[PDB]
Amino acid sequence: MRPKVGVLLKMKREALEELKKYADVEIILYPSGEELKGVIGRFDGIIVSPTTKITREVLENAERLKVISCHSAGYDNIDLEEATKRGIYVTKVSGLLSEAVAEFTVGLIINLMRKIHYADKFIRRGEWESHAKIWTGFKRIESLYGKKVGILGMGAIGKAIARRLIPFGVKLYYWSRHRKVNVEKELKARYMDIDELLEKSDIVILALPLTRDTYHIINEERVKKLEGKYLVNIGRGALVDEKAVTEAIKQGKLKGYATDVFEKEPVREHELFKYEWETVLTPHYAGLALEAQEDVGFRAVENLLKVLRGEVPEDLVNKEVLEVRPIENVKML
Amino acid sequence: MRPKVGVLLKMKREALEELKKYADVEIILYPSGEELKGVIGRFDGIIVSPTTKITREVLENAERLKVISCHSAGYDNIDLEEATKRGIYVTKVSGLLSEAVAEFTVGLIINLMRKIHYADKFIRRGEWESHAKIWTGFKRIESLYGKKVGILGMGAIGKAIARRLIPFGVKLYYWSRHRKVNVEKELKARYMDIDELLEKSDIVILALPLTRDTYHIINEERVKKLEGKYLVNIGRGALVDEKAVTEAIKQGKLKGYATDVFEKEPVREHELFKYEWETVLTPHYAGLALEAQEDVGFRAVENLLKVLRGEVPEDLVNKEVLEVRPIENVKML
């Protein structure tokens, strides 16, 4: 208990006990930007939940901060560039969480293609009048088998989706800021430029982090490039021009849209709500599963301790930080 | 244009044209037993769907019948014992259909576990009040990852399902009327007796043909063995004692049940309709997909023509027939 760690959320008791074995902890549940500004200087590291934002204004007071462990799969609540400039290591949680998200995504894909979510409503309404009504009445349904799937973002989650899709007989295409050749041949995924992928893919999956460079990466023009195709989003609503997506749906241009995320959450009303056949919509819970929720805490604690032990964690988001402040400089344990 | 073929279901024009190249065709849509036995004498072969029952009554007048091609995955609608006795070859369809059903099955599994179908309804009903509402509203969700999945039936569909589940991180157990040593090491699936599988599995999947022996394979007593577990059915409703399954669901014992088939189809009313969270129900359309169905028609036509050309189709269902009437004896093409 020598490094001073601030836990900014309600973590599982067990994960906390593990952390306390190595550091002194201060529990400051979901602090406002002002409250965190006045206490952040006390910590060598912090464990934060998505709801807490680590802005450049917060970092200005992080005099001894060495590591920020995001207890989530995403890290858009962190000003990455500013953290990097200050030599602050930022980590995120993969493990069972990444697996759970990737599993959920494939479920979104199969529902968007095969319409199971729609059929479930259908039968419960008593509409199953006959074999003919279904096998003739149901609009054309395409299978995932034999389709070309293009994935944008090949991080922990993107790779997990790719591995799950192979046995479904799809052809994989992908794009990522940092290209992964060591993954390409393994999963038989052909690297391509964004637009080339949008044009050549039958199905497009969004597994990108939300940054200034990915905001509306799927703009109105690109939505047009997706006429007759399927779009699946598990990153953030802002990865797409949601108004443009919706319009494409209502006009019958975009064949289908499945998403677990929206530009403005929570969503209580939406034009896409009436399009039950063309869309699959979930209330942002792709990472919600018992096993995953139990693992996140341990992983977040492990990621933070690794850095303070002078070890580079595999889930380090801003690897460039290594050049700014060599890991030896932040080793406390 | 030598053999005469009776097409007893609605087939796509392309498949029919293919068939007309080699045989004179007569279309008799979904005939009753009395209607069919009255005309069955004119055909060298017939193409049929699950709704047409080929019985001893019908086969009595089947003087020139040499092959029965089922335009489907299942063949429980055919009396194999009588067909075999009369030296009639019975075939089913494999290929893209099997792939489409396996894909569908995984969709049912992910929905049954992760509740996407329920959440889709939930959000469209405008109940997404907040993040807390969701994450607290339902955390008992379990991921497919790390689970023990027991598959009953390891034929084309069973294998296709198993191959798909591997990357999801499951442990596979299975039972089959005919053990498959090669699949066991290939897919690392552990062979088990039926009751042992039901006891050790977290999730049980039914991909067995319905026969007198597999009738109610999941009976009342076995349902009790599933307390706290998940059951998925994509074969035929009669594979389970549906009433017993329904009770186990209402009594909160069986954790979840998803099925694309029921003992009495079509189903316009059912006790399970109110159990939106605990079940996933689809109107028997697991094999319904464009690419797959176009393949089914050509496959059914080709399985029939192969027999008449004196070739043993790999999809031959009743192999015993070879001892009654060798393939050379039915060669007409």
Q: Which of A252, A268, A286 corresponds to the end of one domain?
A: A286
Q: How far apart are CA B207 and CA B210, in angstroms?
A: 9
Q: What angle do CA A280, A286, A288 make, to 5 degrees?
A: 135
- B117–A116: do the CB atoms touch at under 8 Å? yes
If phi > 0 it is left, if psi is from -120 to 50 it is alpha, else beta; for residue A87 that is left
Q: Cβ neighbours of residue B104 under 8 Å, at least 6 residues apart?
A: A110, A114, A116, B234, B260, B282, B286, B287
Q: What angle do CA A195, A197, A202 make, to 5 degrees?
A: 125
Query: Which residues does chain B have within 8 Å of residue A293's beta carbon, measured at their own beta carbons?
Result: 139
The DSSP 8-state label assigned to residue A24 in this structure reads E
If phi > 0 it is left, if psi is from -120 to 50 it is alpha, else beta; for residue B38 that is alpha
Buried b (16+ CB within 10 A) or exposed e, B91-115: bbbbebbbbbbbbbbbbbbbbbbbb
Instruction: Please name the residue that has the structure tokens 């973590």.
Output: A11
φ, ψ of residue A69 in degrees (nearest 5): -105, 110
Instruction: Please name the residue that has the structure tokens 């090491």.
Output: B185
The DSSP 8-state label assigned to residue A138 in this structure reads S
**Of residues A281, A286, A259, A256, the one with CA closest to residue A113:** A256
- B283–A142: do the CB atoms touch at under 8 Å? no
- Of how many residues is chain A composed? 333
Q: How far apart are CA A171 and CA B12, in angstroms?
A: 28
Pick from B121, B134, B169: CB nearest A285 = B134
* Residue in B101, B122, B128 to test binding to A, most A beta-carbons within 10 Å: B128
Return the C-alpha torsion angle A126, A130, A135, A140, nearest 10: -30
Strand partners, B151: B174, B205
Task: Say yes or no: A169 and A297 in one domain.
Answer: no
Give the number of other CB atoms < 10 A from CB of residue A85: 16
Q: How far apart are CA A48 and CA A39, in angstroms?
A: 14
Pick from B128, B145, B168: CB nearest A283 = B128
Task: Say yes or no: B291 and B280 in one domain.
Answer: no
| CATH number of A332's domain | 3.40.50.720
HEC assignment per residue over chain B: CCCEEEECCCCCHHHHHHHHCCCEEEECCCCCHHHHHCCHHHCCEEEECCCCCECHHHHCCCCCCCEEEECCCCCCCECHHHHHHCCCEEECCCCHHHHHHHHHHHHHHHHHHHCHHHHHHHHHCCCCCCHHHHHHHCCCCCCCCCCEEEEECCCHHHHHHHHHHHHHCCEEEEECCCCCHHHHHHCCCEECCHHHHHHHCCEEEECCCCCCCCCCCECHHHHHHCECCEEEECCCHHHECHHHHHHHHHCCCECEEEECCCCCCCCCCCHHHHCCCCEEECCCCCCCCHHHHHHHHHHHHHHHHHHHCCCCCCCECCHHHHHCCCHHHHCCC
Buried b (16+ CB within 10 A) or exposed e, A227-266: eebbbbbbbbbbbbbbebbbebbeeeebbbbbbbbbeeeb
Instruction: Please name the residue that has the structure tokens 């379990």.
Output: B142
Q: Which of A248, A268, A286 corresponds to the end of one domain?
A: A286
Could you tell me the two tokens for A234? 């598990």
Q: How far apart are CA B7 and CA B77, in angstroms?
A: 16
Task: Say yes or no: B241 and B302 in one domain.
Answer: no
Amino acid in the structure at residue A30: Y
Query: Do B157 and B98 touch, CB atoms closer than 8 A?
Result: yes
Q: How far is A185 from chain B (nearest CA, A)?
A: 17
* Residue in A114, A271, A274 to test binding to B, most B beta-carbons within 10 Å: A114
In total, the C-beta contacts within 8 angstroms joining chain A to chain B are 188
- A116–B120: do the CB atoms touch at under 8 Å? no
Q: How far apart are CA B168 and CA A112, in angstroms?
A: 19
**Total tally of structural domains belonging to chain A:** 2
Query: Do A196 and A221 touch, CB atoms closer than 8 A?
Result: no
Q: How far apart are CA A156 and CA B309, in angstroms?
A: 53
Query: Do B239 and B233 touch, CB atoms closer than 8 A?
Result: yes
Task: Say yes or no: A143 and A255 in one domain.
Answer: yes
Task: Say yes or no: B52 and B75 in one domain.
Answer: yes
- A284–B141: do the CB atoms touch at under 8 Å? no
Task: Say yes or no: A167 and A315 in one domain.
Answer: no
Q: How far apart are CA B323 and CA B225, in angstroms?
A: 41
Q: How far apart are CA A295 and CA A274, in angstroms?
A: 37
CA A218 to chain centre: 16
Pick from B110, B130, B168: CB nearest A266 = B130
Task: Say yes or no: B250 and B177 in one domain.
Answer: yes
Instruction: Please name the residue that has the structure tokens 């208990």.
Output: A1
Helix or strand run (H / E) with residue A9: none
* B 229-268 near A (Cβ less than 8 A): 265-268
Pick from B120, B167, B266: CB nearest A117 = B120
Give the number of other CB atoms < 10 A from CB of residue B251: 9
Q: Cβ neighbours of residue B307 under 8 Å, at least 6 residues apart?
A: B45, B66, B67, B89, B91, B313, B327, B330
Q: How far apart are CA B315 and CA B318, in angstroms?
A: 9
Q: What is the DSSP string of A187-225?
A: HTEEE--HHHHHHH-SEEEE-----TTTTTSB-HHHHHH
- Residue B81 falls in the annotated catalytic set: no
Return the C-alpha torsion angle A18, A19, A24, A26, nearest 10: -120
Query: Do A2 and A23 touch, CB atoms closer than 8 A?
Result: yes
Query: Which residues does chain B have within 8 Å of residue A120's beta carbon, measured at their own beta carbons?
Result: 111, 117, 276, 280-282
Query: Do B75 and B88 touch, CB atoms closer than 8 A?
Result: no
For residue B324, the enclosing domain spans 1-94+287-333
- Which residue pairs, CB below 8 angstroms and at least 24 apart, start in A241-248? A241/A216, A244/A219, A244/A220, A245/A218, A246/A270, A246/A271, A246/A272, A247/A223, A248/A223, A248/A224
Q: How far apart are CA A150 and CA A195, in angstroms?
A: 11
Query: Do A94 and A315 touch, CB atoms closer than 8 A?
Result: yes
- B266–A131: do the CB atoms touch at under 8 Å? yes
At A177 the three-state DSSP class reads: coil
**Helices and strands in chain A: count of H runs, count of E runs:** 14, 12
**Of residues B197, B94, B175, B196, the one with CA closest to residue B183:** B175
Task: Say yes or no: B158 and B256 in one domain.
Answer: yes
B71: number of CA atoms within 13 Å, CB side? 24
- A117–B122: do the CB atoms touch at under 8 Å? no
Query: How determined?
Result: X-ray
Could you tell me the two tokens for A266? 């929570």
* A 151-210 near B (Cβ less than 8 A): 163-164, 166-169
Query: Which residues does chain B have within 8 Å of residue A277's beta carbon, measured at their own beta carbons?
Result: none
Q: Cβ neighbours of residue B256 under 8 Å, at least 6 residues apart?
A: B112, B113, B230, B231, B249, B278, B279, B280
**Of residues A46, A64, A54, the one with CA closest to residue A9:** A46
- B142–A291: do the CB atoms touch at under 8 Å? yes
- Residue B265 falls in the annotated catalytic set: yes
Query: Which residues does chain B have within 8 Å of residue A273's beta carbon, measured at their own beta carbons?
Result: 123-124, 126
Q: How far is A131 from chain B (nearest CA, A)?
A: 7
What is the set of active-site residues of A? 236, 265, 284
Task: Say yes or no: A171 and A25 in one domain.
Answer: no
**Residue A140 contacts B, CB cutoff 8 Å:** yes
Torsion sign, CA atoms A30, A33, A35, A40: positive
Q: Cβ neighbours of residue A247 under 8 Å, at least 6 residues apart?
A: A223
Residue A209: cis peptide before it, omega within 30 degrees of 0: no
Q: How far apart are CA B94 and CA A173, in angstroms?
A: 28
Beta pairing, strands A148-152 & A171-175: parallel
CA–CA distances in Å: residue B51 to residues A217, B15, B31, B222, B316? 50, 20, 9, 29, 20
At A271 the three-state DSSP class reads: helix
Task: Say yes or no: A230 and A192 in one domain.
Answer: yes
Task: Say yes or no: A110 and A244 in one domain.
Answer: yes
**Residue A146 contacts B, CB cutoff 8 Å:** yes
Task: Say yes or no: B181 and B278 in one domain.
Answer: yes
